Design a binder for this molecule. Structure first.
Ligand code: ATP
Ligand code: ADP
Ligand code: MG
Lengths: 178, 175
C-alpha cells in the first residue's frame, strides 16, 4: 500500500494508545484495499484526519513577565486593569508550575478593545490564535460535526480543523454570547 | 471479559443482567466500528459503570457529626443544631429519607458548603448539580439512544462518579 506507509511516517509524533490502536485498525482495514473509490476513501479521510490532528505537540509558552507586559503595551494603549489581570493570570500559572487554562470573559461597551486584546494576549503567551463567533450559530454541527457515515461530513471543523495549527495549546477566543 | 469481571465484582440485579447479556449478544452479531457498534459500546460501558448493589456505610453518630460540623465551618450554631436534630430524628426513624432539607439565606453565606459538610458527617459520597433555568428534562433523565447526542444525565453521572448507590445529591439554586 502506498499511502499506508506515508501515514505511518507522518504519525511519528507522540500519540496516545487509544488513538493509536484506532489508527492501526483503520490502517489494517484500508490495507485490505477492498476497492479504490468509496469505502477506501472514507477510511482514508478518517486516517488523514487522525494523522493530521497533532498529538502531544505543544508551543513553548513565554514565561517572562517582563516580555509579556512589554508586548501587551506594544499592542494596546492602557487597559490597565485588564493587563494587570492578564499578568496575574500568568504569574499564578508560573507559581502552580502548570497552567489551568481558565476561561476569561471580557464584557463592556462596543469598540472598547475586547476582541483585539485577545490577539495581543495570544502573542504575549506565545500561543497560536483562533477566533470563533458563536453568535448566529444555530446548528451544533459547527462545534462538533456529523458522524463519518454521512457523505460529506467534515470533522466538526471549527474545533478539530482548529487543531490543525500544529499546537495543542492555542488561545481560542469565543467572540460573543448572542 | 472486562465487562464480565466488572459485573462480577458487584451485585447486579437480574433484569439488568438479562438486558446486558442481551445487548452483548446483540453486539455478538458483530458490526465492527460503526454507529451501531459504538452505540452498543457506550451503552454497555455506562451499564458496567453504574454501581448496582454496592453502597457506602453511613454514620449517624451525633458525636462525630458534631465534630465534623464544627471543624468544617465556623459559627452557624443554629444551623448546626438543626442538622444535628435532623440526624437524631433520622437515626430514630432509621430511614433518613423523609423530608428534603433546604437552606436559604443571603448570597455568600456558604449554604452550598453545608452540603459537603453534611456528606462528610454522614460518610456519604458528595455530588452537586445546579438548576438555573434548565427548562429541560435531559439534564435529569437524559436523551434517547437514537439521537446523536446520547447522554445518560446528571443522576447516572452522579452514580458512576460516586460508585455508590446511596450518595448525597445537593441541588443548588432551586429558586
Ligand atoms: N485601548 C486601545 N488601544 C489601542 N487600540 C484600541 C484600543 N481600544 C480599541 N482599539 C482599536 O479599536 C478597534 C475596536 O475593535 P474592538 O476590539 O474594540 O472590538 P470589540 O471591543 O469586540 O467591539 P464589539 O463588542 O462591538 O465587537 C480595534 O481595532 C482596536 O485596535
Ligand atoms: N461559616 C463559614 N465557615 C467557613 N466558610 C464559610 C462560612 N460561610 C461561608 N463560607 C465560605 O463561603 C463560600 C461559599 O459561599 P456560599 O454560602 O456557598 O454561597 P451561595 O450560598 O451563594 O452558594 C465557601 O468558600 C465557604 O468557605
Ligand atoms: Mg468583538
Amino acid at each position: 500500500a502506498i499511502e499506508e506507509k506515508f501515514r505511518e511516517r507522518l504519525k511519528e509524533l507522540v500519540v496516545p494508545k487509544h488513538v493509536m490502536d484506532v489508527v492501526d485498525e483503520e490502517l489494517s482495514k484500508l490495507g485490505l484495499l477492498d476497492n479504490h473509490s468509496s469505502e477506501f476513501n472514507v477510511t482514508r479521510n478518517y486516517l488523514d484526519w487522525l494523522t493530521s490532528i497533532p498529538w502531544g505537540k505543544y508551543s513553548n509558552e513565554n514565561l517572562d513577565l517582563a516580555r509579556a507586559q512589554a508586548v501587551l503595551e506594544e499592542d494596546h494603549y492602557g487597559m490597565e486593569d485588564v493587563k494587570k489581570r492578564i499578568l496575574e493570570f500568568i504569574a499564578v500559572s508560573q507559581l502552580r508550575g502548570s497552567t489551568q487554562g481558565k476561561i476569561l470573559c471580557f464584557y463592556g461597551p462596543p469598540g472598547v478593545g475586547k476582541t483585539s486584546i485577545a490577539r495581543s494576549i495570544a502573542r504575549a503567551l506565545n500561543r497560536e490564535y483562533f477566533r470563533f463567533s458563536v453568535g448566529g450559530m444555530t446548528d451544533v454541527a459547527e462545534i462538533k460535526g456529523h458522524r463519518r457515515t454521512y457523505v460529506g461530513a467534515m470533522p466538526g471543523k471549527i474545533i478539530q480543523c482548529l487543531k490543525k495549527t500544529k499546537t495543542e495549546n492555542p488561545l481560542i477566543l469565543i467572540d460573543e454570547v448572542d
